[PDB]
């Protein structure tokens, strides 16, 4: 059975039914400290910073695999680093130990471009590169990638991870995250309202659409245990763009749309990250691939965001 | 007022007296969960995994600086990673938060070449490079560097760190660690006994002599803030050699001594580390320098170890 922690997040919201559709409705169990509609799929409240709660859940549902999504993101982490550290650091440690302790075949941890810092090359950055994160979030994530690879090499625990860039999606509502401007913008656009962007006009960052984000995670998860070499830290991306670019492209569809720039601390966060990633390793080892280019995600988002507003 | 954490270790047993001679026994507080003779300097029992204990020591002694040495090393860390994670990771976070919450001006953390991994270049590795450690010890240490750099950037807490290579010394004795063979070999050499080395004969590693290791840590502590651009993660070294090489050089002084190689898990650890480091950033940003080259250290070690084992009466 599959346990998904932090199932109520941007990813978890869609990953759950995605998994249910592919593996069976009662072979998946959603969990978080905040509950949301799981379309019938079994849900349980689980605090990842409490080792006891994790063990008991693994016990009762005979957990076979774990998609560990619980954690605090970059923006919220800078507003409350003590919290980011507690849930991210203590949290992923607890799950690793709980997984190693019991009979857990696999554990997938989504990593982030946040593991990068200002010394990291800005373009075509490969998976093996400099990793000196400047945010509490990025520190806890690089720690996660290393802890996972260590548990694998040391105890054989099959933990894998890929680094997601900014993710565009419509099912889950934005949460003021560093890269969330790429989602908030569509909401203002469909309402033909002026949007106040918090990242610089030319703040280039790698991004991808949720559909490809989901497939990438499951493909990583379905990869043969003995065919993965990098295993942890796979750079994954679909395209790179600036807020200014996304704006103009959306304007081509909704010309009335207006935008203004009022950057804050989140732009300082984004400035420490690379603009584009090289994902050859993910494609070479487990065939990672994108089927939604920018044009396709823009139209798709407008379509979905308008229909639900 | 300086508080040294993990004072009973290789670095600690010699750093305390060093610090005391530089700033006065009265301005130095040694601490550890294991007490050892400190020679006059005040010693207190302090478990860094207990945030409360740290706050109390900092409060009572009005601590202005912390040399945070407490931790579980590479070898011991692999036999008990859970213990390593708890002491090194949460112990370092505890120190940083406690330093920040209180009024500690500086915190100095000794890191290690252990932060590097297979993907790290093997020769003349610069400070900013690939860091994919393959030991629990190394992961907790790179995390410490990052947490330390974060505490500065986020809260303005003045935290600095350098990465030590293998440290050779005659006062503190090896503790079945990874680079301890470089000290152990001298005890066997002086006694004209066959030394069983646990690292492969061609296992090249960066090393340095204790006196230079101590001076480097204190030089970083006193460094001008204006020049500290890297701040955390300064590579530091003196020389690089393989066990067979150190053996031969020692043999030049004591020919009636030999060695055999029976590698264990520690050689597997060493194999994921680089052979030599580039310590330019440290020299440029805060003046790091070496006083003991390989020959001077071999000869000084033979000297001290010989009298330590009573081969040549203390006079
Ligand atoms: N947001 C991104 O752009 C991004 C990109 C790459 C990787 N990631 C990683 O993916 C994971 C989640 O991503 P997301 O986009 O769904 O973020 P999200 O903010 O949408 O969801 C995170 C979830 O963590 C939950 N959570 C917080 N504390 C918890 C606890 N103690 N126990 C259980 N759940 C807890 C939250 O309630 C939330 O549902 C994180 O671990 C993050 O590091 C995020
Ligand atoms: N030994 C080396 O060659 C070397 C090289 C580079 C960096 N370092 C770093 O220097 C520090 C100490 O080095 P060392 O050579 O003196 O190692 P050591 O093994 O000689 O000493 C480590 C000390 O940590 C203490 N300790 C363990 N848990 C503790 C706790 N919970 N609270 C307080 N103390 C605790 C031990 O009792 C011991 O005295 C470590 O942080 C290590 O990562 C060591």
From TrEMBL, chain B:
NAD-dependent epimerase/dehydratase domain span: 2-188
Keyword tags: Nucleotide-binding
Iron listed as a keyword: no
Domain of life: Archaea
A matching Pfam family: Epimerase
Keyword Nucleotide-binding: yes
Molecular function terms, GO-annotated: L-threonine 3-dehydrogenase activity; nucleotide binding
Protein residues bound to pyruvate: 74, 112, 137, 178-179
Residues binding NAD(+), per UniProt: 10-11, 32, 47-48, 69, 71, 141, 167
GO biological process terms on file: L-threonine catabolic process
Transmembrane intervals: none
Recorded family membership: Belongs to the NAD(P)-dependent epimerase/dehydratase family.
The name this protein goes by in its record: NDP-sugar epimerase
Organism: Thermoplasma volcanium (strain ATCC 51530 / DSM 4299 / JCM 9571 / NBRC 15438 / GSS1)
């Amino acid at each position: 059975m599959i346990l998904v922690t932090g199932s109520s997040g941007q990813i978890g919201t869609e990953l759950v039914p995605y998994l249910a559709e592919k593996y069976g409705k009662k072979n998946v169990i959603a969990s978080d400290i905040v509950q949301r509609d799981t379309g019938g799929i079994k849900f349980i409240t689980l605090d990842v910073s409490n080792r006891d709660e994790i063990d008991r859940a693994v016990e009762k549902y005979s957990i076979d695999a774990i998609f560990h999504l619980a954690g605090i993101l970059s923006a919220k982490g800078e507003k409350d680093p003590a919290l980011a550290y507690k849930v991210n650091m203590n949290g992923t440690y607890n799950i690793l130990e709980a997984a190693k302790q019991h009979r857990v075949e696999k554990v997938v941890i989504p990593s982030t471009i946040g593991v990068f810092g200002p010394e990291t090359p800005k373009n075509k950055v490969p998976s093996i590169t400099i990793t000196r994160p400047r945010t509490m979030y990025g520190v806890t994530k690089i720690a996660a990638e290393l802890l996972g690879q260590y548990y694998y090499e040391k105890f054989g625990l099959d933990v894998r991870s890929l680094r997601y860039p900014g993710i565009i999606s419509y099912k889950a509502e934005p949460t003021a995250g560093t890269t969330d401007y790429a989602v908030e913008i569509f909401y203002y656009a469909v309402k033909r309202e002026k949007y106040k962007c918090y990242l610089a006009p030319n703040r280039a960052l790698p991004m991808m659409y949720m559909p490809d984000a989901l497939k990438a995670l499951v493909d990583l998860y379905e990869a043969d245990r003995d065919k993965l070499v990098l295993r942890n830290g796979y750079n994954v991306t679909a395209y790179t763009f600036t807020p200014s670019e996304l704006y103009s492209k959306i304007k081509e569809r909704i010309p009335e749309f207006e935008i203004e720039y009022k950057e804050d601390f989140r732009d300082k966060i984004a400035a420490t990250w690379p603009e584009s990633l090289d994902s050859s390793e993910a494609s070479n080892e487990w065939g990672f691939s994108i089927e939604y280019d920018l044009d396709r995600t823009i139209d798709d988002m407008i379509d979905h965001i308008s229909e639900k507003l």
